[PDB]
């Protein structure tokens, strides 16, 4: 692990990293949130900001004195604030910011700055390729509404690694966590269809776990099952 001011980053392959940020919230103590670093040739794709914008900050830091490339572009996976919470930081250095079109309208409500662009879904849950030009190896995929209505997952082509986000928990979880915003009705589905998108993907990253195996999608539905 390596440290750069208040976040921690773990090289999960050679062309992915997974940055790790912590907010303390009253009576919960700290709190992780995971997103990942992806080099791409000549250039640095990220997903998911940290929790606040002057952690945020220190990623883009860190890219340019470990990586030294510049920062394309930036997708967030939905409007809550361990995703979202720095897109300042990233507007401030000019780097093009992504998220779902649904989350783009929430953000406003959900006291997040909005991505400055938006992405839309064909109806098998793919990104339309005009909304989202040269993602490089980033495969944008919306499962359907699970953790929120608008989360999104990400897979990471020429690797065998997946990104998640907040639906998905890892197998040791006994909860689905955060509830507040979520479809409980398809949640289940909507965590198989995740897997279903990205088969061969071995290593699962998530927000709020270290990678875990595919169990991690399965025991996440099966969980989802007992909401419905
Ligand atoms: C503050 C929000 O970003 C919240 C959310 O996205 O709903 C954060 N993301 C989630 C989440 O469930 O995906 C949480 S809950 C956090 C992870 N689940 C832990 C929990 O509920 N435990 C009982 C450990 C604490 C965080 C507080
Ligand atoms: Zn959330
Ligand atoms: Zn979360």
């Given at each position: 692990?390596?440290?750069?001011?208040?976040?921690?980053?773990?090289?999960?392959?050679?062309?992915?990293?997974?940055?790790?940020?912590?907010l303390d919230m009253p009576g919960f103590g700290a709190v992780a949130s995971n997103g990942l670093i992806?080099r791409d040739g000549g250039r640095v794709l990220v997903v998911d900001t940290a929790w606040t914008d002057?952690?945020?900050?220190?990623?883009?830091?860190?890219?340019?004195?470990?990586?030294?490339?510049?920062?394309?572009?930036?997708?967030?996976?939905?409007?809550?604030?361990?995703?979202?919470?720095?897109?300042?930081?990233?507007?401030?250095?000019?780097?093009?910011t992504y998220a779902n079109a649904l989350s783009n309208q929430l953000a406003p409500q959900e006291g997040?700055?909005?991505?400055?662009?938006?992405?839309?879904?064909?109806?098998?849950?793919?990104?339309?390729?005009?909304?989202?030009?040269?993602?490089?190896?980033?495969?944008?995929?919306?499962?359907?509404?699970?953790?929120?209505?608008?989360?999104?997952?990400?897979?990471?082509?020429?690797?065998?690694?997946?990104?998640?986000?907040?639906?998905?928990?890892?197998?040791?979880?006994?909860?689905?966590?955060?509830?507040?915003?979520?479809?409980?009705?398809?949640?289940?589905?909507?965590?198989?269809?995740?897997?279903?998108?990205?088969?061969?993907?071995?290593?699962?990253?998530?927000?709020?776990?270290?990678?875990?195996?595919?169990?991690?999608?399965?025991?996440?539905?099966?969980?989802?099952?007992?909401?419905?």
């Open positions: 692990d390596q440290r750069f001011g208040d976040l921690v980053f773990r090289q999960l392959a050679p062309n992915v990293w997974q940055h790790t940020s912590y992806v002057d952690q945020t900050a220190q990623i883009l830091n860190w890219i340019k004195q470990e990586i030294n490339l510049p920062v394309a572009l930036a997708v967030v996976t939905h409007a809550h604030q361990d995703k979202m919470g720095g897109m300042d930081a990233l507007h401030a250095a000019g780097i093009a997040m700055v909005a991505a400055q662009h938006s992405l839309t879904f064909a109806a098998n849950g793919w990104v339309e390729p005009a909304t989202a030009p040269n993602f490089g190896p980033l495969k944008v995929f919306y499962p359907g509404p699970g953790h929120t209505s608008d989360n999104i997952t990400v897979g990471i082509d020429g690797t065998d690694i997946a990104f998640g986000g907040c639906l998905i928990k890892d197998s040791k979880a006994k909860s689905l966590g955060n509830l507040g915003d979520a479809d409980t009705e398809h949640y289940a589905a909507s965590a198989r269809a995740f897997g279903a998108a990205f088969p061969k993907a071995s290593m699962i990253v998530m927000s709020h776990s270290a990678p875990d195996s595919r169990a991690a999608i399965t025991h996440t539905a099966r969980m989802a099952d007992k909401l419905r």
